[PDB]
Amino acid sequence: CGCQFTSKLEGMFRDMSISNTTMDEFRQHLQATGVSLGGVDLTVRVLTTGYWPTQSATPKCNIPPAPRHAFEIFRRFYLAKHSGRQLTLQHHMGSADLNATTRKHILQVSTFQMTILMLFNNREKYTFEE
Amino acid sequence: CGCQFTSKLEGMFRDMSISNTTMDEFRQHLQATGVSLGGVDLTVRVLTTGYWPTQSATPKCNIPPAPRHAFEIFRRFYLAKHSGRQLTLQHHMGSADLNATTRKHILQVSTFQMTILMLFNNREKYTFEE
Amino acid sequence: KRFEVKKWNAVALWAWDIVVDNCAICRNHIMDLCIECQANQASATSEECTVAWGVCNHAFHFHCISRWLKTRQVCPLDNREWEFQKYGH
Amino acid sequence: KRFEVKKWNAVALWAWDIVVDNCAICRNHIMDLCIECQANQASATSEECTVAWGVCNHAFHFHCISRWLKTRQVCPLDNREWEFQKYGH
Ligand SMILES: [Zn+2]
Ligand SMILES: [Zn+2]
Ligand SMILES: [Zn+2]
Ligand SMILES: [Zn+2]
Ligand SMILES: [Zn+2]
Ligand SMILES: [Zn+2]
């Protein structure tokens, strides 16, 4: 096609490798601090809105204690640099590994079932209204 | 005298104005965060050891609850967006405004009487042993 | 507990000095149209007067940066030459 | 309470990659002398083998930094000319 969209392509790939370096950087920062216990193994990727469109609406539903504390730590870190501008509140992206427990089988939740499962952990026997 | 110590002089003055800009930057970052009632009014400055020598020993005395929370917030902020900077704990520098309470007269403590007055607030009737 | 989270992999988006609620070129709002279009309508041509997104995550009214490219061409909020990648919001 | 703190004005000092406990030029320790001195004494001329402090807030042994300055003065860690501003510790 030529160098006209392949430029945005390099944009995306660069975002990717740079967020991988940012993941190693944040690992050392969590070893130096890591106040929020909820923020454990974190693969936070710092991408630019100038390349990645908003999925549907960028939601801000109840965050789950572990990923809540995790999101608070990530937002505090991201605002320590850009005063005010913190981690964008979104739930329509990513994944997780839910360690369940006869053996300990670890499940997987793609940032959608974390809140419902956390509310179940807090109190079972819920419904759509809850 | 000539340009030989006046260089370190510019060093110090630059430290000063730059720490004033850093104070405005931290005001922004504590407006995004600063959830604890420990960061009501904070005036943290940032200097370099390459220009400002140690006073006597850079001690490690117990800090007071609200100054404890303020120093914790400042250290968490500094141990993040800064270029490998290590927030140091020192009591032999600075001041404070102790709001006492017939009127509400605000006192002043130069980072030396904060711990003793905080221990008095926690429990009065102390002595040298306490 | 019965379910405990071990790993997480959020992706955190970031915005520069877009100042969601004001344009740095004309100073009006993230909406409320611009200085050239004034009122929301006032011949806005089916609301084509939209927001422009740069590679440096800086957001202005399309119109206000477009006209800034007839005089300068280096984004007033840093120094980067500035591109025309994402649009709308 | 009877006394409540309203304002505070701490001054927070900072250290770069001085790594208090190791020198980045010879890798020995913040003390324990250097590779050119080995033993604490071993003719250290009344312990003149001290720590050098740069403007970049980096700290390596005097002998070690002398050899680095003799060649290229760009600081083994970052990229600063390195000045003999502060000394000792
Ligand atoms: Zn505008
Ligand atoms: Zn317009
Ligand atoms: Zn820009
Ligand atoms: Zn050495
Ligand atoms: Zn030596
Ligand atoms: Zn250096």
Side-chain angles (χ1 to χ4, degrees), chain A residues 57-72 80 84 89-102 106-110:
Chain A
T58 319
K60 17 98 246 93
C61 97
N62 139 263
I63 355 247
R68 171 160 266 167
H69 298 352
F71 182 81
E72 287 178 0
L89 355 123
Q90 83 270 285
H91 294 85
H92 295 349
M93 194 49 64
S95 60
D97 293 332
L98 181 65
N99 195 333
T101 299
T102 301
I106 291 88
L107 295 180
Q108 189 275 156
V109 281
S110 60

Side-chain angles (χ1 to χ4, degrees), chain B residues 98-102 106-112:
Chain B
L98 181 65
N99 194 333
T101 299
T102 301
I106 291 88
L107 295 180
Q108 189 275 156
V109 281
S110 60
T111 331
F112 290 153

Side-chain angles (χ1 to χ4, degrees), chain B residues 4-24 32 34 38-73 80 84 89-102 106-113:
Chain B
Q4 61 268 355
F5 295 132
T6 54
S7 2
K8 112 204 320 136
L9 248 121
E10 296 334 283
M12 225 79 151
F13 280 117
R14 279 183 257 120
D15 283 28
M16 277 281 128
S17 26
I18 275 325
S19 32
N20 129 75
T21 76
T22 305
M23 153 86 180
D24 71 64
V40 181
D41 291 320
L42 257 290
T43 339
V44 238
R45 308 283 301 262
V46 169
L47 306 186
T48 68
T49 111
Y51 279 122
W52 309 75
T54 140
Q55 303 300 327
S56 62
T58 64
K60 30 70 181 180
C61 174
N62 100 325
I63 0 235
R68 273 179 183 178
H69 298 352
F71 182 81
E72 287 178 0
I73 293 179
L89 12 117
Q90 127 253 283
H91 297 66
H92 295 349
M93 194 49 64
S95 60
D97 293 332
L98 181 65
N99 194 333
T101 299
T102 301
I106 291 88
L107 295 180
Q108 189 275 156
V109 281
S110 60
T111 331
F112 290 153
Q113 313 85 358

